[PDB]
Design a protein around this ligand. Sequence first.
Ligand SMILES: O=c1[nH]c2cc(C(F)(F)F)c(N3CCOCC3)cc2n(CP(=O)(O)O)c1=O
Ligand SMILES: O=c1[nH]c2cc(C(F)(F)F)c(N3CCOCC3)cc2n(CP(=O)(O)O)c1=O
Ligand SMILES: O=c1[nH]c2cc(C(F)(F)F)c(N3CCOCC3)cc2n(CP(=O)(O)O)c1=O
Lengths: 175, 171, 405, 399, 404, 404
Amino acid sequence: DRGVQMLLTTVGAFAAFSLMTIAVGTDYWLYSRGVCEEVMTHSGLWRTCCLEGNFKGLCKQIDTAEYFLRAVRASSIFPILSVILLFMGGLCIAASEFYKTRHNIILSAGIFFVSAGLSNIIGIIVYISANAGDPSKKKNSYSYGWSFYFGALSFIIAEMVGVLAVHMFIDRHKQ
Amino acid sequence: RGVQMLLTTVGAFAAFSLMTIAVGTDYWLYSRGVCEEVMTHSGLWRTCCLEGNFKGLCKQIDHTAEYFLRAVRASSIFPILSVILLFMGGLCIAASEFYKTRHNIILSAGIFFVSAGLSNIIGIIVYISANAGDPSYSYGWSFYFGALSFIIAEMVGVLAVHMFIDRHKQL
Amino acid sequence: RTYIVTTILEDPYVMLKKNANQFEGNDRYEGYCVELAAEIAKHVGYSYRLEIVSDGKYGARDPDTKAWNGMVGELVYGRADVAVAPLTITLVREEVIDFSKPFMSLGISIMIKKPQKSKPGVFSFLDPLAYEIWMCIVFAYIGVSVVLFLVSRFSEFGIFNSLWFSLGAFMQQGCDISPRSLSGRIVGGVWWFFTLIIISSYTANLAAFLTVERMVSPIESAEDLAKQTEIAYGTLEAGSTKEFFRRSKIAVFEKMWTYMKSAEPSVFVRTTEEGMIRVRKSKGKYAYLLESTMNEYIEQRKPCDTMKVGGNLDSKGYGIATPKGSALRNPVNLAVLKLNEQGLLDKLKNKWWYDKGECGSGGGDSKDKTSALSLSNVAGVFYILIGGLGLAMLVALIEFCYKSR
Amino acid sequence: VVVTTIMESPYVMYKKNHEMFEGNDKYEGYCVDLASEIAKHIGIKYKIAIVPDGKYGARDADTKIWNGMVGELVYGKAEIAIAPLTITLVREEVIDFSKPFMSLGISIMIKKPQKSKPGVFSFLDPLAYEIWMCIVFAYIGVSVVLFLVSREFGIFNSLWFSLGAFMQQGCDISPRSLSGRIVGGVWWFFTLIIISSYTANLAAFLTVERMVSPIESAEDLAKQTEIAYGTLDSGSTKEFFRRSKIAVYEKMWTYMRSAEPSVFTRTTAEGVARVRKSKGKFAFLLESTMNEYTEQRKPCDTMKVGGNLDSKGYGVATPKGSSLRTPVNLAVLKLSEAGVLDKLKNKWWYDKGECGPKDSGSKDKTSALSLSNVAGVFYILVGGLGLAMLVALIEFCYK
Amino acid sequence: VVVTTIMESPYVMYKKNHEMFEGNDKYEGYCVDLASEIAKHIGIKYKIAIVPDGKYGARDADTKIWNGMVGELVYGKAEIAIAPLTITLVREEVIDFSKPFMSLGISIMIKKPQKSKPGVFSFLDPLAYEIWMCIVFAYIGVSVVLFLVSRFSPNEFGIFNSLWFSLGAFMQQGCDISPRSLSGRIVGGVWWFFTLIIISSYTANLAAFLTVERMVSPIESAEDLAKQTEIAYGTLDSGSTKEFFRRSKIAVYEKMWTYMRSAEPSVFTRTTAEGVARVRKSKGKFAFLLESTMNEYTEQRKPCDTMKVGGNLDSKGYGVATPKGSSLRTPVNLAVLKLSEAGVLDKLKNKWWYDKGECGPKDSGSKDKTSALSLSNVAGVFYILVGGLGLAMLVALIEFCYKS
Amino acid sequence: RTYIVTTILEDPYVMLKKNANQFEGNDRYEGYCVELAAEIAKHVGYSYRLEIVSDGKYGARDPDTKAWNGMVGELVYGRADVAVAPLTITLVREEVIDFSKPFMSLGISIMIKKPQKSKPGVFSFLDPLAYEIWMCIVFAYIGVSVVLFLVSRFSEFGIFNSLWFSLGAFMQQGCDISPRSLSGRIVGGVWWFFTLIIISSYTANLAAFLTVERMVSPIESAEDLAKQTEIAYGTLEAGSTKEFFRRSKIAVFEKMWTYMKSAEPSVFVRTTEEGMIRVRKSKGKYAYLLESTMNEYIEQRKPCDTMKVGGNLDSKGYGIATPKGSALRNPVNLAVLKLNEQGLLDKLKNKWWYDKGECGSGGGDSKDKTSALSLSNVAGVFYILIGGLGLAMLVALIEFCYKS
Ligand SMILES: O=c1[nH]c2cc(C(F)(F)F)c(N3CCOCC3)cc2n(CP(=O)(O)O)c1=O
Ligand SMILES: O=c1[nH]c2cc(C(F)(F)F)c(N3CCOCC3)cc2n(CP(=O)(O)O)c1=O
Ligand SMILES: O=c1[nH]c2cc(C(F)(F)F)c(N3CCOCC3)cc2n(CP(=O)(O)O)c1=O
């Protein structure tokens, strides 16, 4: 019963790819109430815009142990490295599904899935540090948007693939 | 294994001597108290102030769960029963060293002695709880003999359970 | 001859019957004042028929064109001999006529809303750590679980053993799955450090939150009100209370008088009813500073959200008005003193102020004051736990599937 | 004008400099300064005299005479009585009373509220009882569930596993069922969270040490409690309690009539001495002015007023047919309205006091934890140890 | 009788807006009420005229003319003036001044901090700093002693096994297998005792840290302010404070002046309104220097974000100025002295300075702000989490490369 | 001609050199007042000879039954023109003579002793508990250890195994060997319950002690001292302080005055040096109000255990006596105001009040309050760690001796 397992890994990777694409495309991260005054502002990691207010229609780009994290938040280097490593993991699992003889390919696949978990944790923690790190932020707050839940679901399917593919590693190692 | 039985005998006799010094005399009460702060002492059946305004006298003192603990702490009947149970424990240890072929009743004597020890523990801690309950008491070098009574009870118990470990090889 | 008495209704004296005006007239009067009038008429002997107040007010000094109005104004200007309706003691009232005796005392008292709060259930579990931290630690727990599986199977000891070790590590319990390589051991050690500092921080914050929540005390007396901050309070304008506050010279009284003298908010209001309604609307921080009698009346009303706190600031009294030189001044004084001594006034106060109150009949309704985590706040954990246990029971049946289906 | 006054401790006292001056400037307090203020208000030369009889003023009802201040004013000895005198039904047909310038009534008083030191209750002084009933119920439930779902776990091994889970420890053996893992994890989580909550609650209780008011805080709570109650032998309180129709005081009267006769005391000094020697004993019902005087004296231990009951008035007494009756009436009304008797009351009964700790709370050192909070643990420890060694002896001897 | 008073000073206030309570007493404040009090004390007609110069007083010695209230007095159109006017060398020799009714001070002010949100220092804030190094040293030492006991004394435990045993010993969890010896029991027990005492102390310390808050001031004195050299400072572009700083004699003041000499981001503020706006906008730096009376006036202003640290750099006072000697100089001098000795002047000062302020009513701090553990106190915790888990993964990878 | 300057014998201003003997003549006195007199004589131009008043008292011009004496008394009698000495400005000494200018500001203020608490070592470790409780828990631990060993021998294991299991049970540890049988299981459970309850109680007690230690209210200004009602305060029977307290007008100062007049702490002072001695001997249980000048002199000259706190309660000045009808009235005023504005007087004040003072408060930095632990109570944790390493080396050496 390994064909259903590899199909589950493939569909989980495809779901992760779809979630990454709609994350880098849409701006539904946080249902923040800011200005465009507490109004619904699509605060984005890569694109922050508005729907209401007098300035609706035009929006622009956002931007000894704190400067590095501030530069990380400004440049979004870890989400970018994350999506690149998901692309590399998709390429390597495509090589695995087309070439079965090689063995280190799924070692690389498991390492890529785990590092995807690492980079997702780093990205979400720097995002919540950027959001909840200011004492100024504002009568209402919190109430995270949909794309936070999509990122959480991407994380859950990340442990799903990182459990099932590693189980496939264990069974192919013991056989 | 003569060293083991001579150790038990000397420990029992030392415990006899020090517990008689502990409970027999009138020496265990130091605190900042008024008997005008002068030297005061409690006792088993009477309280006495050695000097001050009470020279030459040694006065017979008086006095569900709360009533029981107050009676035990004040009348000191349970400490009397505990030291008398220590007396029977010492007597049955003397019978044990007189009856050396007693496999189980020697162990039973050990259990009775440690039961008397834990009874003395509960008695002294309810006594000091009542002492701390007066406002809403320190070692008197004979209450220190009571502490040494606990220590020598634990020591004779640990060497006894060491020689029942030796009895495991013997039996 | 029939004697008419001037009666003015505010609460609850000359309130009309619920059957409109189908009765014979003066006999359709129920209240403290009319019962006292009937008793005082039966004591010595005269007529207790009521009269209609001409102006509807109590009367003032009126320096313009002199004269008088109200119940005392009708009494002084003929056609009145007995006044039953209560009225406060004031110098301009005394300089014209004389009172008999204050039948029952009163005083200006502070008024606050009844503190009502309800402890939550599953939401009470997220008080001292919010909800983002719990999500972060749960997702980090599953991440370190899969990482522990990777390092145990890469550097028995399956996914089940990895979950065993991680679940034991999350509560500092430990497990027997000890890998030979030091890597999994150091991963477990740093995760132990993280979960222990989370537990310590949670305990610290819950202790701090409990201490700061329970440390606060309800307002009482007048000095605590004087040094109180961030809570609004004051009195009305059209009344003798403002005159008494202005005429006071006591250091504490003049102190908070100067405090609300620079009334930046809307301290002064017009009527008691509108002020009471807007206190109901706000219900978070205001005080009206009314008389003790009307406060005791309104804390027995239908909403049952007001209560009497503190004591009386002064020693004001009531009194029944009688004209000077009349034959019904001394006998009414003797009889009202007799009824005050007999306790019948206390009986009437109890029946018309505590017995006829449809709401709050039992004053001692909540007086346990349990200053500990009872089964209202921490038992919500007992909810989620049993829910989790229910979840356990639910997964039990699916594990029963894993047992038999 | 000549006035007579009765030597009453919370109204008139002898000055410390008794030999400095004798006469008008020889007393300080409420009564004499109020007399001086009203005398300056009307304008008259005044002198202070003491009562020759010492009676408060009452009718003997057999010889038709009065003894005390009312007896002196009726029989022509004084034309004014600035001394305090309550208003009664019998003292109106022979004497005239002004408007009451003070309000007083029968009020409760208890002993000093102090922190109790229980033995067993201090083991679970925070939290409640139902919390530990439910934690034991959950312990038995999780033990039974873990025993049944695992089928080495017998009727003792699962109990040991749950018991070890109850005190932050793991176990030597682990099952191979994920249901057991899930139930053990959720039980571990519950145990940890409830231990943290209990420790924090104990920390808050130990860091506040706030004393709560006793049960004796209202008349309804007074009738529903088992504590004793007392009053004065014969007086205004006894006369008020002799006849009642309020249906709340008849129960109190029957409680007096059915309890021990020790509830009656002669003097208020004997009463405060009797209530001072015990934290409980009999709370008393006495005058508000007596309570306010006793709460601001050198023994600053009991200062509890509680709720206010009954109504009584204190007024100045004037004889019949006096030209200053209206004058003294308007004078006392002006002093009550503008406010100088209340100012002097605040300056003398509140500002002048032996201790000012009642005005604002103070922080005291909590000192050592002592042993009362721990003594309850040792009892269950030694009891469980004794039960364990008895059952060990029985099990090893029989089985 | 003519009296002058500058309206552009925190000593007057308008009654309503205009055409309300019209007449003579149109301005209410400290100085006008003091003038009315002394006029009732000695007998002086009341006036309302204001000099159109605007400045309180200056010495234009280049043009040989005096501008302001002092010039209006010396050339002559009035004889009594009540206004905030400093006393200097050139002003005394032309106009005699009475005794100073109020002492003047010069002090520095800083913006009130909001919160601190550091990185790993958030978790480093409790249990001090050197305790971490000492407890790591203790962990290394107990690991070395445990390894010595297990190996030299009479096993199946290397250096890695010993350090893991010590790490699990540090964390009140237990061990997989006991050494089963009479030697290691005591050292394991004392190490467990030390680590549980440390953990309980940390929990109690964080509880005490979180139950109440203090907001300790970053600075406390002018000498420490000059010594720290991390916060920008600017006095004023020109005026009495700038002249005093440019011609001081105390040793630290020359260093302070040289610090103003090497000032990059234009610390010389043109107006005091711009200065207070700048110090209220940014709280990280740019603390201001200003007179004590203006600082205390801004202390009770609607933004409510300012706090002085105390200490008076210079001491002077505000005096009453009169033209030359006459029959009124001694009278007004004794009137000012009598009002200064009595508390009536202090009564007016306290009343007009505290009844017009609302910011200071909430004294000390507000205890009704708890919320929960937001990420500000958790940023250190999750940063040490991400660092520990990343380093653990890295050492796992390198240990696999070493062994497997 | 030769002019005279009369100086009162006052401790903080003029000093008669204790050496006496030589240097007698012109330089008979060294101090602030004689230096100011030398400077003013060098500035305006004259020759000054030092003089001492006969009665040794300041004196006044009260309207009594003549018998006038003092500094102003000898000034008005004729044999005095310039008096360079401290002199409080008062109305009773203004109706006959006028002062020039206050060179420095006087203010009455509270003074407090230094709060110093030295946390002990191993004694501070048992501070967050009773020593009876520590004795109880340790002795109960050894008792249950031997009881568990005997019941395990009754119903594989040795003395070392018994000690290991007992202490790991004592301090929440796992073990490789299992507590077999239900009796041993329930002993382990009940004793784990005891160790959990006692560790929770100890953590709660330590949290309570640290919370009550940090949450403390230091005394600042006068309102906090008024509403703390725990530290005694008072002033002299007569003087400027008594006159200011008699004429209080503010409600809080009226409360302070009536608290002082309640005579609960009384005055308890005759000479202010005796008040300084008794407030040093009160161990912080008493407080006293005196002038800021002499308070600074006490804080400098005396050993550093007392200082000032809070701001000045009132504004007051100084002055020098001048004759009513002499030509030495205006130039001395102009020159003393020039010296006050220039800062040379400030330089002399700094030299005489900061340099020649045997105190490290102004000559060195203070201690920063970083909260948390400061090697004071955790120092006791490090001394019980020293005891732990002593036990570790003891058990290791005794084990190696036993095998040897
Ligand atoms: O003689 C007087 N007797 C009064 C009796 C009452 C009350 F009994 F409570 F009804 C009141 N209420 C005060 C609260 O709001 C409702 C009216 C006002 C009275 N006033 C006017 P004041 O100037 O407001 O005291 C008098 O003059
Ligand atoms: O009406 C009455 N009012 C009273 C008021 C007071 C007081 F408290 F001082 F105000 C007192 N004091 C009680 C304490 O001892 C001294 C007298 C006695 C009163 N009595 C006498 P009884 O008959 O013994 O009650 C009355 O009759
Ligand atoms: O005599 C003088 N008296 C002054 C009094 C005041 C104050 F009382 F504070 F209002 C001030 N303020 C300084 C702060 O900004 C607002 C104006 C300036 C004064 N100046 C000008 P400087 O020379 O720049 O000090 C004088 O000359």
